[PDB]
A paper describes a structure:
Leukotoxin ED (LukED) is one of these bicomponent pore-forming toxins that Staphylococcus aureus produces in order to suppress the ability of the host to contain the infection. The bicomponent pore-forming toxins have two separate water-soluble subunits, one of class S (related to the slow-eluted component of PVL) and one of class F (related to the fast-eluted component of PVL). The S subunit is typically involved in targeting the specific cell type via the interaction with surface receptors and in the recruitment of the other toxin subunits, leading to oligomerization and the formation of an octameric prepore. The prepore is composed of alternating S and F subunits and is able to assemble a β-barrel pore domain in the cell membrane, producing the mature pore that ultimately induces cell death by osmotic lysis.
Crystals of LukE12–311 and LukD27–327 provided measureable X-ray diffraction data to 3.2 and 1.7 Å resolution, respectively. Each of the two crystal structures had one molecule in the asymmetric unit, and the two refined models included amino acids 30–311 of a total of 311 for LukE and amino acids 27–325 of a total of 327 for LukD. Furthermore, LukD–HlgB superimposition results in an r.m.s.d. of 0.97 Å. The phosphocholine-binding pocket that is occupied in HlgB by a molecule of MPD in the pore structure or by a molecule of phosphocholine in the structure of the water-soluble monomer is occupied by a molecule of bis-tris buffer in LukD. Since it has been shown that the core of the cap and the rim domains are rigid between the monomer and protomer in each member of γHL and that they conserve their relative orientation upon octamer assembly, the structures of LukE and LukD have been superimposed on HlgA and HlgB of the γHL pore complex (LukE, r.m.s.d. of 1.67 Å on 232 Cα atoms; LukD, r.m.s.d. of 1.66 Å on 246 Cα atoms). The superimposition of LukE and LukD on the HlgAB complex reveals conservation of the residues that are important in the electrostatic interaction of the protomers in the complex. In interface 1 of the cap domain, Asp44 and Asp48 of HlgB and Lys15 and Arg16 on HlgA are involved in the interprotomer electrostatic interaction. These residues are conserved and correspond to Asp69 and Asp73 of LukD and Lys43 and Arg44 of LukE. In addition, Asp66 of LukE and Asp69 of LukD seem to also be very important in stabilizing the stems in the soluble form. Indeed, they are involved in intra­protomer hydrogen-bond interactions with Tyr141 and Tyr142 in the stems in LukE and in LukD, respectively, as well as with the main chain of the stems, indicating the importance of these residues in the transition of the soluble monomers to the pore-complex state.
Residue numbers in the entry: 27 to 326
The structure:
Amino acid sequence: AQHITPVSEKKVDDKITLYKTTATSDNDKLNISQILTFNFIKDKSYDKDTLVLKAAGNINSGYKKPNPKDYNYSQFYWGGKYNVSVSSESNDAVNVVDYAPKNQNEEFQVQQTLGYSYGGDINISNGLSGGLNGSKSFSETINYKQESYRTTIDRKTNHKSIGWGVEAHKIMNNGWGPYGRDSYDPTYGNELFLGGRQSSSNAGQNFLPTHQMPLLARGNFNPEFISVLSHKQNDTKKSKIKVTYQREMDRYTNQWNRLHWVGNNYKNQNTVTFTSTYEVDWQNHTVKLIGTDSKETNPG
């Protein structure tokens, strides 16, 4: 159910006007949804258009509970890492100039408020504030849960692109750990989601139960990221923005070796990607969905 809202114009103050449009793009099979808020800013004091683009929506983990009847070997897939990127293309007058979060973050809840001030300055504050009808300045917020995970900014990031990774980082298993995607014990392997080393249960029932796993590992990730792009007002061409949501699905396994159990986590055994490409009209402050691309490296 693709949809783009009509442009809404709001005068922020005597110099600044906001033109807001939200675009939604989904892939029901992959359970990935992109909710993109395009906040176009026109500033009488400054010779560039600014776009504060908020990327929200949903990326399912792809987790499915293992079969409880799996006897001595079992496994499941889970959300090892979520990747989100925004890139500009088809117009050299457009550049990525700021973004949030700016820095590596392992807080359980990422909450920031990004503001615009005349002349193109961007400000950032921790926590959630503003964005009200009476607010005399423009702001937009990011708010997302990532307990046990860590946000990092992609290297690839430059003047045409910004990307983030939200990766399983410090996961506790009944007081033991923290474990990660590549933890190692010489006897027991990676105990990340192992139930018990000597359990008499079936393999399918010898994993850390679902509700004790991180929400991002077995449920969904609800991304909220901001990309700030500038566009020279001497340019009158449209441009394109490509937004990519991706999950790396890890395969966690257990096995009974006759003496004890062994766990292992296999990183990124299935990569699932959904990309939407929008045509941006900087004069009219409107967007149009060009296309979408969906991929799954190892479907099962």
